[PDB]
Amino acid sequence: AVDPGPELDGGDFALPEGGLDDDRRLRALDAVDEYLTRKRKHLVGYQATQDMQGTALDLARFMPNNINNLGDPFQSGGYKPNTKVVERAVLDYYAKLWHAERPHDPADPESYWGYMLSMGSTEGNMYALWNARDYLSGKALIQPRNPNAHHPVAFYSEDTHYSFAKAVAVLGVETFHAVGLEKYADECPLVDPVTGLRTWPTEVPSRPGPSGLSWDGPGEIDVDALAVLVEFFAAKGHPVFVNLNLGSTFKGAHDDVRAVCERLLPIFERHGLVQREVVYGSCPQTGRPLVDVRRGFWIHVDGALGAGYAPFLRLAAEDPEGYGWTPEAELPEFDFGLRLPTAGHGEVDMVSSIAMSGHKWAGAPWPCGIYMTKVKYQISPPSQPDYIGAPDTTFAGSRNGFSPLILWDHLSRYSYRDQVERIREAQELAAYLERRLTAMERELGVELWPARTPGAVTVRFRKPSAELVAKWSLSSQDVLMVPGDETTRRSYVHVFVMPSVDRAKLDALLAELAEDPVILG
Amino acid sequence: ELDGGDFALPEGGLDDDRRLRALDAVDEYLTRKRKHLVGYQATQDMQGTALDLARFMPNNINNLGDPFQSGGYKPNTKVVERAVLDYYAKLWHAERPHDPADPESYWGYMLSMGSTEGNMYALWNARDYLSGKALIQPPRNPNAHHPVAFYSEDTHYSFAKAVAVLGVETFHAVGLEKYADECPLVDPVTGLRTWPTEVPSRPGPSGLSWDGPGEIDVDALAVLVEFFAAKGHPVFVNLNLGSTFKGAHDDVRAVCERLLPIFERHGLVQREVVYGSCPQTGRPLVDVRRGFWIHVDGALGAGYAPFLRLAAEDPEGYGWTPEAELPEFDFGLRLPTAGHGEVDMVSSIAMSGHKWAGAPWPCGIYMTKVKYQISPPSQPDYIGAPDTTFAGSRNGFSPLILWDHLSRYSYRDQVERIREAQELAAYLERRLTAMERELGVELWPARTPGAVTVRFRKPSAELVAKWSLSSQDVLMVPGDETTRRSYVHVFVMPSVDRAKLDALLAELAEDPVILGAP
Ligand SMILES: COC(=O)[C@H](CCSC)/N=C/c1c(COP(=O)(O)O)cnc(C)c1O
Ligand SMILES: COC(=O)[C@H](CCSC)/N=C/c1c(COP(=O)(O)O)cnc(C)c1O
């Protein structure tokens, strides 16, 4: 019934040999603006903040500059039109927020190192897995018999973003599923709840919902299942990479990072993964190999979304009277401050890396974000180029130096208290949306299948008409309610309550949903 | 310089006055530096694009997924992206429109990093294509699945990075591991058959590559490729079209002419590749692929080389005969086969938008053909469009930047921009040698014919920092630290005019390092 409005017409944008005159150019740019403006005002289906008027006014002035943050953020280098001083300020802010040790100091192994991304969190997840692959496999670091010792195995839940399947293929890192099928075909330690067979699952199971299966579950990793699987491979001598989702793509779930770490640390200690000798080369002499001591596990937090708000929710949880708000759900401790005792290695700082997207919670006009780790994990760069004047420590070559300005401007405009208010309002509006959807089910006598993981800023429900989906940029996911069986398909959409989503917007969507031909049946 | 104290972000935020003071300091710094940058291959002038496109900064634009389907994230510019890709497809003699049913048609996408993303993607695509991974769904020999990478010593550092990321083996690594005593090349310094770390570039007056043009040695490449091709390995070759330090153009046409007979001899034009086995019986499923992949790293040069070649083809029509010949390099390069058929030789091209065009952030293009596309790493529901790209979320502002640029200039205007830069690079070289004679000092000026960069002796740190001169140290005899020389270069981009060069030259003539030159 509803109108998403006209798409852009390719004929208006065709670029001829002779160029376009000023009138045709302006007509085309006006068409783009009219399209983008309509869509941005109605987007509620993706985890991307849409309002940034203040930053546009503040930062339009920088568009004439070909800014390039080429090389490591902690040295200018030769390309002087760079914003690395701003980039370091942004990195410092998040280092504090995530309880990392600051300042960055190459002589302090425990201090943070990180950089701003030129893609989105895909770059941060790729970098994390590259960094972890090399660290766990014995490649040389920056700072000074078991056949599986150099064969890391990757673990993550079924709710993990597709960037990991991509990163694993790019980097040649083997998942527990691939290694299971290849080397350990009949030894899967988990029983499949559908078939009762010991078949290796493709990802670590997520927690079950009312169905007994993960499709209607919260989207959080099953800690028990993870621990069983990690023990299996750790006992075989494999080092371990674990990715944990802090604000998962479809359900906005938060893996219980503290619970995972508590449950895995004894496994790591039992199997000699807290501190182990690693050979990182050899030379022709009576003696040969070079050895150093490393951990044999790497825990990465994919906070693409959640690393931007979770610190603020946790601040309120710590001082609910001070912020005038008690969050309804507990968000897990997840950051560089998470430290656990051991039987005989002292306290262990559990997380090795975090990724976050700037175009998610904060909002940006293009993809950006942060990768952060510690100095002690940095890998020797792939080469030493004289011509950038700064080391090649990043995934990108040339880097977006406008993104530091975007995030700096944002962060400068809000206090911690203001940031707590933004996550509070989103949490409360997500709860409101869930309430209104069930009230709609009762008023109209229709099924909407609404679902919201406690503490998530997204609510899922039955997919409406294609036109409504297109108007409001609703993201879609199909599930089979019984894995394998194509007849059990349900189509869901979700709404992400970002800081640019307010009550009026949700009420306008809900009014259209109540008259939608698919919803009504 | 910028003081970090002005940019520290307190828990409580900054007020409007502190915020504006800091942003003004950034602007004053960037503006001074942008107006004097001449040492990097980055166009610094886009005032028109800022006026046209600042209006879009309020939008969180995202070109999530493949460019040729919209997907669910509606604030996207994929219509514009496709117009830009169509323009470069035509410019590079690719087949358009993109059509998933036409194996010969182009496929490509706009990059969210710079050309690093395009080179990484190229090598990923090649690795998987050459190793027998499944291709995208349309609408004996122990080395068959072990591709070997070849590129010159002037290749950008993104390749060393990409090789390490992707686990692709270079000819040097494979040579050392499998064929340690069989190197077919003799080292010109030592006389030993030691595997070189990259394919040699052409020698200069020294007899060594440090003062050479920066172009790959086609003979040496052919010898190396034949060696591995004869062993049964498939082959990836990267060729530099506007190299990082010397601005050299590998002779793509000469390389292709020299390699095709090698590929024909060793069964690399059409070969059966096993891509798994049948679900029931473990029996090799097969399709026919080429066993080579030629990539052109045109980060810089793919943006101007088409226009110079336009003028070379019609010099009276454009009023300019380019002094240097730039090689045919693009998707239109087709050679006759032994049987009097035709083979299209180039598989992929990368270009950066922040180089010749100019942009406010890194961007660019990767382009290949439909016949080379690999099946996406997975098929999720929630972006709408297939995951066919290196990035996930993609910069949809960059399409607007390049569309705006391309719409403003005719082919003739673009020919004028490369003409002016070629002529100013020649002027700079003339002025530097005149300065040597006037002052009685050696500046070691060097310009590869047809390059838009000139190299010379590193001046003072103060001048280097003022003009953002990029630096390179070379050893004039490999492995001897006593033969080190420090060079800088100047890149004559469209934002570099005569007045700017004359101002630089005036400072160089009074520079203490230049005047103090032993
Ligand atoms: C379908 O929606 C998505 O895939 C969005 C990107 C679009 S909203 C900004 N999320 C990307 C994402 C990513 C990848 O981030 P990007 O590279 O910025 O797309 C990594 N991890 C998690 C947990 C993510 O949710
Ligand atoms: C010393 O300067 C450089 O490395 C510049 C990037 C800065 S100028 C835009 N060149 C990058 C470059 C790259 C990498 O491109 P980016 O990822 O955009 O840095 C790839 N290939 C060639 C032939 C290149 O010259």
DSSP string, A169-180: HHHTPEEHHHHH
Distance, CA B371 to ligand 2 centroid (Å)?
28
Give the DSSP letter string of B201-253.
BPP-TTSSGGGS-S-B-HHHHHHHHHHHHHTT--EEEEEEBS-TTT--B--HH
Specify the resolution in Å. Answer: 1.5
Closest CA to B260 of B228, B230, B292: B292
Pairing of strands B148-150, B169-170: parallel
Distance, CA B355 to ligand 2 centroid (Å)?
8
Nearest-10 Cα torsion for A181, A184, A186, A187: -120
* Measured distance CA(B149)–CA(B315) in Å, rounded: 38
Is residue A160 less than 8 Å (CB to CB) from chain B? no
Structure-block tokens of residue A216:
């209607």
* Measured distance CA(A461)–CA(A474) in Å, rounded: 11
* Measured distance CA(A515)–CA(B472) in Å, rounded: 67
* Measured distance CA(A364)–CA(A358) in Å, rounded: 6
* Measured distance CA(A103)–CA(B193) in Å, rounded: 49
* Measured distance CA(B18)–CA(B5) in Å, rounded: 11
Q: Which residue has the tokens 């050479």?
A: B212
Method for structure elucidation: X-ray
Kindly list the residues from chain A whose CB atom is less than 8 angstroms away from the CB atom of residue B362: 68, 118, 396-400
Count of Cβ atoms closer than 10 Å to residue B429 Cβ: 18
CA distance A416 to chain B (A): 6
> Nearest 5 degrees, angle CA B12-CA B18-CA B23?
120
Pairing of strands A174-175, A153-155: parallel
Closest CA to B113 of A403, A219, A131, A139: A403
If one residue of B156, B329, B356, B471 were mutated to test the ligand 2 pocket, choosing by the most ligand atoms within 8 A of its CB, it would be B156
Residue B256, SS3 per DSSP:
helix
Minimum-distance ligand to the CA of A362? 1
Closest CA to B119 of B345, B249, B250, B296: B296
Long-range contacts of B50-53 (CB under 8 A, 24+ apart): B50/A60, B50/A63, B50/A64, B50/B360, B52/A25, B52/A29, B52/B404, B53/A29, B53/A63, B53/B397, B53/B400, B53/B401, B53/B404
Residue A208 is given by DSSP the state P
Structure-block tokens of residue B187:
């080292």
Kindly list the residues from chain B whose CB atom is less than 8 angstroms away from the CB atom of residue A73: none
Q: Which residues line ligand 2 (CB under 6 A)?
A: A 68, 70, 387-388, 397-398; B 40-42, 113-116, 119, 156, 158, 240, 243-244, 297, 299-300, 352, 354-355, 362, 470
Whether A8 sits inside 8 A of B80 (CB atoms) is yes
Residue B429, SS3 per DSSP:
helix
Please name the residue whose Cα sits nearest to atom 1 of ligand 1: B383
Radius of gyration of chain B from Cα atoms? 24
Structure-block tokens of residue B33:
């530096």
Q: Which of residues 267-326 of A touch B (CB under 8 A)?
A: none
Structure-block tokens of residue B156:
């950008």
User: Among A26, A61, A63, which would you mutate to test the B interface (most chain B Cβ atoms within 10 Å of its Cβ)?
Assistant: A63
* Measured distance CA(B294)–CA(B279) in Å, rounded: 34
In A98-158, which residue ranges form alpha helices assigned H by DSSP? 121-137
Nearest-10 Cα torsion for A102, A108, A112, A115: 110
Count of Cβ atoms closer than 10 Å to residue B206 Cβ: 12
Contacts for B245 with CB less than 8 Å, ≥ 6 apart: A387, B154, B214, B453, B455, B470, B472, B487, B489
Minimum-distance ligand to the CA of A125? 1
* Measured distance CA(A330)–CA(A327) in Å, rounded: 7
Contacts for A207 with CB less than 8 Å, ≥ 6 apart: A214, A217, A218, A219, A220, A221, A222
Phi then psi for residue A199, to 5 deg, are -95, 135
Distance, CA A119 to ligand 2 centroid (Å)?
16
Q: Are B458 and B464 in contact (CB under 8 A)?
A: yes
Domain B77-411 architecture: 3-Layer(aba) Sandwich (3.40)
Minimum-distance ligand to the CA of A122? 1
Residue A389 is given by DSSP the state S
Strand partners, A370: A116, A356
Point out the ligand 1 atom lying closest to the alpha carbon of residue B64: 7
Is residue A186 less than 8 Å (CB to CB) from chain B? no
Pairing of strands B271-277, B235-240: unpaired
What sign does the dihedral A447-A449-A454-A458 (CA atoms) show? Answer: negative
Structure-block tokens of residue A493:
């959409």
Distance, CA B183 to ligand 2 centroid (Å)?
31
Is residue B180 less than 8 Å (CB to CB) from chain A? no
From residue B401, how far is each of A339, A511, B271, B460, B496 by CA, in Å?
Answer: 46, 38, 42, 36, 20
Is residue B34 less than 8 Å (CB to CB) from chain A? yes
Please name the residue whose Cα sits nearest to atom 13 of ligand 1: A121
Is residue B366 less than 8 Å (CB to CB) from chain A? no
Is residue B118 less than 8 Å (CB to CB) from chain A? no
Q: Calculate helix-pair angle for A176-183, A223-235, nearest 10 degrees.
A: 50
Q: Calculate helix-pair angle for B252-265, B218-230, nearest 10 degrees.
A: 20
Phi then psi for residue A357, to 5 deg, are -100, 130
Kindly list the residues from chain A whose CB atom is less than 8 angstroms away from the CB atom of residue B44: 65-66, 81
State which amino acid sits at residue A303. Answer: G
Structure-block tokens of residue A406:
């975007």
* Measured distance CA(B432)–CA(B513) in Å, rounded: 15
From residue A340, how far is each of A259, A348, A409, A482, B318 by CA, in Å?
Answer: 11, 5, 36, 39, 72
Whether A365 sits inside 8 A of B398 (CB atoms) is no
Is residue A337 less than 8 Å (CB to CB) from chain B? no
Q: Where are the beta strands (DSSP E) in B43-85?
A: none
Closest CA to A376 of A197, A216, A221, A144: A144
**Fold (topology level) of A83-416:** Aspartate Aminotransferase; domain 2 (3.40.640)
Is residue B153 less than 8 Å (CB to CB) from chain A? no
Whether A81 sits inside 8 A of B44 (CB atoms) is yes
Kindly list the residues from chain B whose CB atom is less than 8 angstroms away from the CB atom of residue A25: 52, 404, 407-408
Minimum-distance ligand to the CA of B359? 2
Q: Are A129 and A171 in contact (CB under 8 A)?
A: yes
Nearest-10 Cα torsion for A194, A197, A198, A199: -70
Minimum-distance ligand to the CA of B352? 2
Is residue A162 less than 8 Å (CB to CB) from chain B? yes
Contacts for A459 with CB less than 8 Å, ≥ 6 apart: A430, A433, A434, A437, A450, A451, A452, A494, A495, A497
* Measured distance CA(A312)–CA(B149) in Å, rounded: 48
Whether B9 sits inside 8 A of A412 (CB atoms) is yes
Whether A25 sits inside 8 A of B84 (CB atoms) is no
Which strand (E) or helix (H) includes residue B181?
none
Largest CA distance in chain A: 84
Q: Which residue has the tokens 């085309």?
A: A28
Q: Calculate helix-pair angle for A403-413, A84-97, nearest 10 degrees.
A: 50
Structure-block tokens of residue A125:
């997840």
Q: Calculate helix-pair angle for B158-166, B115-131, nearest 10 degrees.
A: 40
* Measured distance CA(A127)–CA(B245) in Å, rounded: 27
Q: CB of B382 closer than 6 A to ligand 1? A: yes
Point out the ligand 2 atom lying closest to the alpha carbon of residue B42: 9
Point out the ligand 1 atom lying closest to the alpha carbon of residue B383: 1
* Measured distance CA(B466)–CA(A422) in Å, rounded: 43
Q: Which residue has the tokens 């390092």?
A: B513
Is residue A45 less than 8 Å (CB to CB) from chain B? yes
Whether A62 sits inside 8 A of B27 (CB atoms) is yes
**Residue in B4, B75, B158 nearest the CB of A85:** B4
**Residue in A37, A89, A416 nearest the CB of B7:** A89
Burial (CB count within 10 angstroms: exposed 0-12, middle 13-18, buried 19+), residue B401? buried
Whether B62 sits inside 8 A of A80 (CB atoms) is no
In B293-376, which residue ranges form alpha helices assigned H by DSSP? 305-313, 315-318
Residue B105 is given by DSSP the state B
Q: CB of A436 closer than 6 A to ligand 1? A: no
> Nearest 5 degrees, angle CA A462-CA A468-CA A473?
90
Structure-block tokens of residue B466:
């003022």
